[PDB]
Amino acid sequence: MNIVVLISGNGSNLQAIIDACKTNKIKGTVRAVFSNKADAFGLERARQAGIATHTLIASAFDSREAYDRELIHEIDMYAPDVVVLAGFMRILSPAFVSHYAGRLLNIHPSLLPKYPGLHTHNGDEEHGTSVHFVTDELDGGPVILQAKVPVFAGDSEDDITARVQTQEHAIYPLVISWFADGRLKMHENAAWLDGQRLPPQGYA
Amino acid sequence: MNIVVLISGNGSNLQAIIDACKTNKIKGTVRAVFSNKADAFGLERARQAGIATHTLIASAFDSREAYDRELIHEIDMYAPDVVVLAGFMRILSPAFVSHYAGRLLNIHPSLLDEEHGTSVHFVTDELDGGPVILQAKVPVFAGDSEDDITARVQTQEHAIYPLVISWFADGRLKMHENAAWLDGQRLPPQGYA
Numbered sequence A: 001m002n003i004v005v006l007i008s009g010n011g012s013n014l015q016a017i018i019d020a021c022k023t024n025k026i027k028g029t030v031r032a033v034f035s036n037k038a039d040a041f042g043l044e045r046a047r048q049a050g051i052a053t054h055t056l057i058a059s060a061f062d063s064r065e066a067y068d069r070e071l072i073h074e075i076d077m078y079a080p081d082v083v084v085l086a087g088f089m090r091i092l093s094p095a096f097v098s099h100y101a102g103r104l105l106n107i108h109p110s111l112l113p114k115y116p117g118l119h120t121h122n123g124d125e126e127h128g129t130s131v132h133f134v135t136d137e138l139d140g141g142p143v144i145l146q147a148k149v150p151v152f153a154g155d156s157e158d159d160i161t162a163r164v165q166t167q168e169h170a171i172y173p174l175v176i177s178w179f180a181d182g183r184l185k186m187h188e189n190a191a192w193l194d195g196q197r198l199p200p201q202g203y204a
Numbered sequence B: 001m002n003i004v005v006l007i008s009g010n011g012s013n014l015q016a017i018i019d020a021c022k023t024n025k026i027k028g029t030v031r032a033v034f035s036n037k038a039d040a041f042g043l044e045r046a047r048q049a050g051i052a053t054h055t056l057i058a059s060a061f062d063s064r065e066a067y068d069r070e071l072i073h074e075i076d077m078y079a080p081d082v083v084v085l086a087g088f089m090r091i092l093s094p095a096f097v098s099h100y101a102g103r104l105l106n107i108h109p110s111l112l113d114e115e116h117g118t119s120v121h122f123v124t125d126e127l128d129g130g131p132v133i134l135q136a137k138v139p140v141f142a143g144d145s146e147d148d149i150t151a152r153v154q155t156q157e158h159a160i161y162p163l164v165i166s167w168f169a170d171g172r173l174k175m176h177e178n179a180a181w182l183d184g185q186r187l188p189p190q191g192y193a
């Protein structure tokens, strides 16, 4: 099945997805990669894997709606069964969200609200990452899987972040594979795995 | 003055034009780069230059027509004053050619022993035809190889195509009735010089 990934940066998560499609762990094909930043290194990961790229920059458009109308237009050329946001830094409008309702995924490095992340100030606790269906509740549509990342004394911000990214790379291919195998659906602003409704914090 | 460049491979010509816009030698801006091959190295030259990129692959389209319809559509998002074909390996349909009439430029490595050279011309529906604007003949001697010919023709491509684009940016070059006209003067079959 066809996966279209949207990025804005480095693309380490895109790459974990491409490799999981290479080793047949996801039953799918990344057909196109989309960026809102022209220098994004994720476009070079796509080029080397021979995947078609498109970059849509906001200044080039007249209105937010205009941008999303074209973004929809270009994504649909690849007949997506999922559209995966992997570090996509733009908010998607109501028309975009409803257009891909139930097959629009996102990963945020947080669990459900408190998380010692940033490093703008090792440590205590609360740190992680969750993959969730994207809804109009910005950053807060239904969670599918989360992963708590253990903090330790001898940890730096780069230690924590790298550890979070290592968990992002494990869970996002897992979720997209359950989606590709027909086991994950959204309805009633709830995530469903094998017909069972997931609790607010995902599986398990 | 907006430049959209269309490529299929290495992109050395694209690099020569980005370079000339930087140096204000071409008073214009490359606004986007289109490719019909996903792996094309010119896409990487565009990424580093910070230029928007779009790859349209033929297998994704159902027909020639559909493809060119999407190409026009995505190019016109960048309101091109000129569309520059710089190693783009696909024949553009009559409809596309019509749509960018007098605004579509191409470079091909043959003027139109040593028979070798390169020429820039306006694209008109006579494939490879359309009026020549500027050529450069490249002599070959015994000893230099086909690759050294290529390398010499390429040095010239990088000299004449930023130059035609420079004239087009300054409103000095126009196409009318299947003839190129620089400063009013009608260019002869072999272009300027």
Ligand SMILES: Nc1nc(N)c(CCCN(C(=O)CSCC(=O)NCCCCOP(=O)(O)O)c2ccc(C(=O)N[C@@H](CCC(=O)O)C(=O)O)cc2)c(=O)[nH]1
Pocket: A007, A008, A009, A010, A011, A012, A013, A014, A042, A085, A086, A087, A088, A089, A090, A091, A092, A093, A097, A106, A107, A108, A109, A134, A135, A136, A137, A138, A139, A140, A141, A168
């Ligand atoms: N409607 C809707 N739209 C969404 N996009 C979302 C997505 C969630 C909100 N979102 C994010 O959480 C950030 S991306 C997640 C993340 O941190 N990934 C890191 C790991 C992957 C990268 O690493 P690697 O590249 O290596 O894989 C986010 C954060 C900030 C802005 C924002 O205001 N952004 C802009 C405004 C942008 C605009 O709308 O034009 C601003 O003003 O700053 C927008 C969205 C949603 O839930 N609903």
Ligand SMILES: Nc1nc(N)c(CCCN(C(=O)CSCC(=O)NCCCCOP(=O)(O)O)c2ccc(C(=O)N[C@@H](CCC(=O)O)C(=O)O)cc2)c(=O)[nH]1
Pocket: B007, B008, B009, B010, B011, B012, B013, B014, B042, B085, B086, B087, B088, B089, B090, B091, B092, B093, B097, B106, B107, B108, B109, B123, B124, B125, B126, B127, B128, B129, B157
């Ligand atoms: N209607 C129309 N369409 C055009 N696109 C053009 C322009 C292109 C015409 N053309 C060429 O000039 C070929 S020589 C180009 C070249 O390498 N220049 C030097 C710079 C190199 C970059 O170097 P660097 O990347 O490093 O900058 C060309 C002719 C035929 C095929 C063809 O049959 N091509 C395909 C068919 C493709 C299709 O239509 O689907 C085939 O069967 O193989 C392909 C191209 C035109 O004049 N008329």
